[PDB]
Amino acid sequence: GLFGAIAGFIENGWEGLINGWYGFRHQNAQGEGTAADYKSTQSAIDQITGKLNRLIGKTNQQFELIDNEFNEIEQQIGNVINWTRDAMTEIWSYNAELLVAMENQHTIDLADSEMSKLYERVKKQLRENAEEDGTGCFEIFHKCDDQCMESIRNNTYDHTQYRTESLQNRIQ
Amino acid sequence: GLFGAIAGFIENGWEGLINGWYGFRHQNAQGEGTAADYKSTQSAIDQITGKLNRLIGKTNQQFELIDNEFNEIEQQIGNVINWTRDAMTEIWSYNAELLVAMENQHTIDLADSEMSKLYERVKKQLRENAEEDGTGCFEIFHKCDDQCMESIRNNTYDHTQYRTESLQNRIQID
Amino acid sequence: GLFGAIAGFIENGWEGLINGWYGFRHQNAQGEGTAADYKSTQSAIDQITGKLNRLIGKTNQQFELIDNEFNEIEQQIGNVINWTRDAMTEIWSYNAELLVAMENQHTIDLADSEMSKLYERVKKQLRENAEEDGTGCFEIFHKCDDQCMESIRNNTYDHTQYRTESLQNRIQI
Amino acid sequence: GDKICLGHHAVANGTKVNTLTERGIEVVNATETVETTNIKKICTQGKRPTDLGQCGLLGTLIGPPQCDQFLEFSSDLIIERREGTDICYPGRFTNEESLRQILRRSGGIGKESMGFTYSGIRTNGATSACTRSGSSFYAEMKWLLSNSDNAAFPQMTKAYRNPRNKPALIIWGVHHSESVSEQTKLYGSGNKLITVRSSKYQQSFTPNPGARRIDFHWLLLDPNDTVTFTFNGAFIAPDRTSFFRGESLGVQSDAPLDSSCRGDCFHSGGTIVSSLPFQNINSRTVGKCPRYVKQKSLLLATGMRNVPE
Amino acid sequence: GDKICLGHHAVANGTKVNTLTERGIEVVNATETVETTNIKKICTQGKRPTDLGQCGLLGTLIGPPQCDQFLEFSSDLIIERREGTDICYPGRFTNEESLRQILRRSGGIGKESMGFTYSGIRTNGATSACTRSGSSFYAEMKWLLSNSDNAAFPQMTKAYRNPRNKPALIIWGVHHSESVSEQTKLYGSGNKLITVRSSKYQQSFTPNPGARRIDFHWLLLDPNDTVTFTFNGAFIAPDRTSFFRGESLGVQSDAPLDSSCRGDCFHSGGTIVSSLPFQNINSRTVGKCPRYVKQKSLLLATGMRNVPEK
Amino acid sequence: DKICLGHHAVANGTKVNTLTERGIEVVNATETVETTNIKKICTQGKRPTDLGQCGLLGTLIGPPQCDQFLEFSSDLIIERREGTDICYPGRFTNEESLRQILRRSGGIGKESMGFTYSGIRTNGATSACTRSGSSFYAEMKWLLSNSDNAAFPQMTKAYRNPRNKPALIIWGVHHSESVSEQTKLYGSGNKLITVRSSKYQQSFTPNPGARRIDFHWLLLDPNDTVTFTFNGAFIAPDRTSFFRGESLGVQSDAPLDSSCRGDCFHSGGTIVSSLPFQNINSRTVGKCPRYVKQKSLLLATGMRNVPE
Ligand SMILES: *[C@@H]1O[C@H](CO)[C@@H](O[C@@H]2O[C@H](CO)[C@@H](O)[C@H](O)[C@H]2NC(C)=O)[C@H](O)[C@H]1NC(C)=O
Ligand SMILES: *[C@@H]1O[C@H](CO)[C@@H](O[C@@H]2O[C@H](CO)[C@@H](O)[C@H](O)[C@H]2NC(C)=O)[C@H](O)[C@H]1NC(C)=O
Ligand SMILES: *[C@@H]1O[C@H](CO)[C@@H](O[C@@H]2O[C@H](CO)[C@@H](O)[C@H](O)[C@H]2NC(C)=O)[C@H](O)[C@H]1NC(C)=O
Ligand SMILES: *[C@@H]1O[C@H](CO)[C@@H](O)[C@H](O)[C@H]1NC(C)=O
Ligand SMILES: *[C@@H]1O[C@H](CO)[C@@H](O)[C@H](O)[C@H]1NC(C)=O
Ligand SMILES: *[C@H]1O[C@H](CO)[C@@H](O)[C@H](O)[C@H]1NC(C)=O
């Protein structure tokens, strides 16, 4: 992926995360905890659905018989028709291959981008109160309970409240 | 887009920024002020122009008539011709739709990228003298007058000059 | 590129780096040194190889003769054939030009991406021991010898080992 | 110490897809874009089909025994079959494929009398090759004969003006007797000449005694235009002419009809029913179809890269 | 205290465009890629046009009265009209559409006498369908017949060598009389056969009496190569042959000519003046044209994503 | 003490094109359009037939030029410019359709149709086809009356295809030098030839005055019968043809070379390439890269080149 998050600095995905595409996992004095993030999950699915809306359910042009299976037309016209049919097949097989390969490249990078953006969102949210682990985690330098973990997840965390406690925990 | 600046961490655009694509809005003891960034703006325009040059003004392909619109040709060969023409129409309509959709995708992300670059450039510029507030602003931890703001915009800001004042404003502990 | 490293905040490339696409140039008390990085170089080379695997050595479908160089075919069908061939040529000429242009755009951005990834990895490594100067360099705030520089390249760099020294060096006036 | 970790979901077994960079990279989910599922039926729901069976499409114009039930028909989906046959007496149509192509998209045909009446000749020429209940002939045609063996056929003119606001499909035949004396038997002795003339068509025909065949020719007669027939024997006269109804699709298949499924894309082996952009079923299709590709499968990723443990 | 913010521009209302993942997303500015503006005229500025009017393109070769003014012409833009006609006497050109395609790109035609003189026969064959300074005939053709009614038309041979460095367009006619009686009156009794041979062409023709008809046939005679005509009647002889001038475009249209605009792309509805890669005006075009597509509009984004103040 | 990150560069970079830029410089690039032609027909691994003076359709009827190719077997048929189908004036109806089915035939095998005659002559010959004196097409029989101006008897000849593959049936109509000539070789009065199989019926009349023999053909299904009925002006098949398998047909002036492989052929030789495109020839046969108008289309295989 172009952004280096998914299959990058984040080791692996979570099989337990059944509720969404992206999420948070926290450890504190109360234990483990996993919760899915709605916004980034919905952003990614909307973009995947948009690709599908483009490719699936297209209106097609009508094409008629220019041949005759039961009454062979002169081989001269038949071979011309066949050359053209094969030439069309060549183009569409090329286009399809390229379209799918190109879309898949974009889909993978798009999802990697969403992970990165959420990671960046949290980083800026935590300010001076945390340091990044390098593996997708933030080492928080203040006591942070389940209510505190929730405030981070839904963008209501106030860094000012913990700045003094965090800064002295960071400077030792 | 892919970079999360435009329609991302930056809430909205500035309708008052009429002299560029990207800009700085500052706040100090002297007041407010907005100035466009030329370098980032031109970099985005040059790339968009490049796409335009590749599609508009292009040398067209040569066309001739194989049909007759007044004295219609024999039905068999005429149907072969019509089939082939419609197959061309199908391929070109597909190509056109895909080209534009792909280019538009890249143009949006490209613009998002330039905003991201300019942001990251200022961040590295300010060093330990400022903090990101998450909305695309840097809160500066020293007095920064109009000329100080100017040095940031024109990339001459020396972080050494303010580091001492900044650090004792940021690190508010013993 | 989209990522702003190559031809961006990193001023220029190094002609002296011949053992890879990306690498580290360090300065300390022992002098300077330059070492290439296998991981990001290989990751870039493999992705470009993948692109060549797609375009090179394709199986092609068979086409037969539909006209005649030595004895001209009936002129109406000849004109249709010729009209069809030109149309085919235009489509393939368009496709080839678009493919190359699109692939090259992605290739450049891809390499830019790999440079950015490596930079961001080293930033996370050094934690609070270093400050970035904006040109792609990290100002290490402690004495970091050739063997210490090694560990940064090797991903074995323990930041806790130098944290206290570097922190008090960053605070001093 | 307390920590918060960001991450993404993964599955135990993902789906291998192709990108520009990699072949067989694993993603969480993928969806097929190439239709491979065929229906071995002609899906005719919401459509008015005509399965011509033993009747050849050109037979609907002249009317051999096999085409009696299709002399007038109305449909938007005309299905031809391998066993379909145009004629009963040996002979052919001039520009047969061109004629077949306009008939397939006609929406069926309506028939109208041309008001031709005859006297001083016979009208009931018949052959064992066209049996209805004994020797019969083409239902839409009249085999004109002299009053008796070796009697002179009269020089005849017959004109028909198209009174409708659409082109009339005018058909006529030329009889090539099995011998010179056979031509003398049925018509007068001497050379026979048939001229057919409209304001846009002019052609003359002479019989070729010995060929034992009836060859059919045709024109489209514009509204208000007149077709004039001048002949003195060997002339297979039209009794009725055809008018097209509207629009139809022509199909060639061996697949049975099925009115319980809907479909817009037809081929030799039936119907392709799909919303997918591409199909790998048949390169030769008719109707509104996904484009044919040579790949069996092209999977579109609908999820991120899959990285598990 | 003090702060500095980075941002981008926006407008009140932007333009909807399509991307790979989203339909109708709004951007600051977009540009049209598909041409829909038609000029209902043939733009003939910078060009030497030939409006054929009542004369058919193939008529210029044989010379019916309506084509008198076009027997020889030079142009890079040949305009055909619906009312154009190739013939006076009933009849068809074999391979007529192939010949039209050739003439459309010829740059025009120049005529040269074939030097045919005749003995023991008449040359003044004529019809009231081609009335022009007398009940005449096709201007480039000779209607040959016997010296008197019913007289035997001599077995004849005429040869012509192309004396130029470019192909000669050779035309001839086979006359199909109104009746067997007429054919005998004009050319004498018995079988009639016409043979035309060049180094890369050989065909025989028999008249088909019954329908008043003069059917025209043609070949391209290579430089230095000879065409030979052997015949015993029912033969319409060429008096002149044609030579092509260079390069041109051929259009079928009813749109009037306009010399005050330049165009390189033409169709039945007029002219397309555009630098856009695609057009939705007409699928049948001639010249240097944008590719025909079925979409009415494909907007190409020329700006960033538009995010107004909420 | 500092550690700097960076990337490689070269003095001489390659200019390539992208979606946004023209002639942008990269570290390295690879050509995608093939321009190297081989001025030879590469026939290694193949069994080739260089027809030379013999026209492809001539192999069916057998004029002097084609005596070497009456039965040939190959997977690569090379037609030459100086190839001729006939010796006596005339042609094949649907000639190109016949050429196209022959080019992929894999060669032809010949089988006797087993026609015997009495009451007529079968030894017709012309000085136009010399093969040590006057002769005729080696696979055909020129049927005449027993003597000058003698009546040619009404005749019927039938042949059932015994093999498990279609039979190519050729016959000819002789259009005499004159009306006098026709009654000399055959009887007086109108001549008619009718040819019938269970899915083909056609009659032919001669066209006296235009000295020529025109050949006509049909494909006869296994277990089906051709019937010839004729009273003169008929050129009879002595042998029918059966296709051997599969072949590719090429038109070229390029010499054969058995020392190189190739699968893409054109008038100017062979295109050997793994590249997806080629700018050598727009008209090709076999398995080829696609033809493009561009001479060169370089694919970047390296990052942007930024020198100091
Ligand atoms: C053009 O292509 C069609 C479709 O393949 C050919 O028709 C088929 O011929 C093959 C091989 O002989 C048979 O297996 C099929 O049964 C035929 N019919 C169909 C409907 O597939 C046709 O022969 C080709 N035209 C020419 C002139 O070769
Ligand atoms: C091929 O397509 C053309 C145009 O689509 C057909 O000709 C047109 O038919 C329509 C509808 O019947 C007429 O109103 C137009 O006047 C025709 N001409 C043009 C230029 O639009 C044509 O009939 C088709 N060919 C065959 C053999 O059916
Ligand atoms: C730059 O790319 C070229 C291809 O354009 C490479 O050339 C190939 O190099 C190998 C040797 O390593 C040869 O075996 C091939 O024959 C070459 N192929 C072609 C098409 O020339 C070259 O290796 C690249 N240069 C560098 C320095 O990496
Ligand atoms: C088609 O193109 C070939 C090769 O360019 C040319 O020789 C020929 O004249 C063209 N055929 C017709 C019928 O115009
Ligand atoms: C926007 O694009 C249009 C073309 O659609 C053009 O007229 C104009 O120059 C562009 N710029 C602005 C600021 O409107
Ligand atoms: C994803 O796509 C597959 C195949 O198209 C589909 O069957 C499945 O329901 C989807 N998976 C999930 C988890 O929704």
Author numbering:
A (entry chain F): 1 to 172
B (entry chain B): 1 to 174
C (entry chain D): 1 to 173
D (entry chain E), E (entry chain A): 10 to 142, 144 to 158, 158A, 158B, 159 to 220, 229 to 261, 263 to 276, 276A, ...
F (entry chain C): 11 to 142, 144 to 158, 158A, 158B, 159 to 220, 229 to 261, 263 to 276, 276A, ...
From the paper:
By using x-ray crystallography, the structure of H7 HA from the NY107 virus was determined to 2.6 Å resolution. NY107 is regarded as a low pathogenic virus, and as expected, was produced in the HA0 form. However, subsequent digestion with thrombin protease to remove the His-tag resulted in cleavage to a profile on SDS-PAGE comparable to that of an HA1/HA2 form. As expected, NY107 HA is structurally very similar to the Avian-H7 in all comparisons and closely related to H3, the other group 2 members used in the analyses. Although the NY107 RBS is similar to other subtypes (H1, H2, H3, H5, and H9), a previously observed specific feature of H7 HAs, is also observed in the NY107 150-loop region: two residues inserted at position 158 result in this loop protruding more than 6Å towards the binding site compared to other subtype HAs. More interestingly, the eight amino acid deletion, only found in the North American lineage H7s, from position 221 to 228, resulted in a complete loss of the 220-loop. Sequence alignment shows that Arg220 and Arg229 are conserved in all influenza A HA subtypes, but structural alignment of NY107 HA shows Arg220 occupying the Gly228 position, and the much shorter loop turns at residue Pro217. Indeed, due to the absence of 220-loop in the NY107 HA structure, the “aperture” of the RBS formed by 220-loop and 130-loop in regular HAs is increased by ∼10 Å, so that the branched, internal, and perhaps more complicated glycans might be accommodated more efficiently.
The two membrane glycoproteins on the surface of influenza A virus, hemagglutinin (HA), which functions as the receptor binding and membrane fusion glycoprotein in cell entry, and neuraminidase (NA), which functions as the receptor destroying enzyme in virus release, form the basis for defining subtypes. Hemagglutinin binds to sialic acid (SA) glycans present on host cell surfaces. Here we report a detailed molecular analysis of the RBS of the HA from North American lineage H7N2 virus, NY107, including glycan microarray analyses and structural analyses of the HA in complex with an avian receptor analog (3′-Sialyl-N-acetyllactosamine, 3′SLN) and two human receptor analogs (6′-Sialyl-N-acetyllactosamine, 6′SLN; Sialyllacto-N-tetraose b, LSTb). The overall structure of NY107 is similar to other reported HA structures with a globular head containing the RBS and vestigial esterase domain, and a membrane proximal domain with its distinctive, central helical stalk and HA1/HA2 cleavage site.
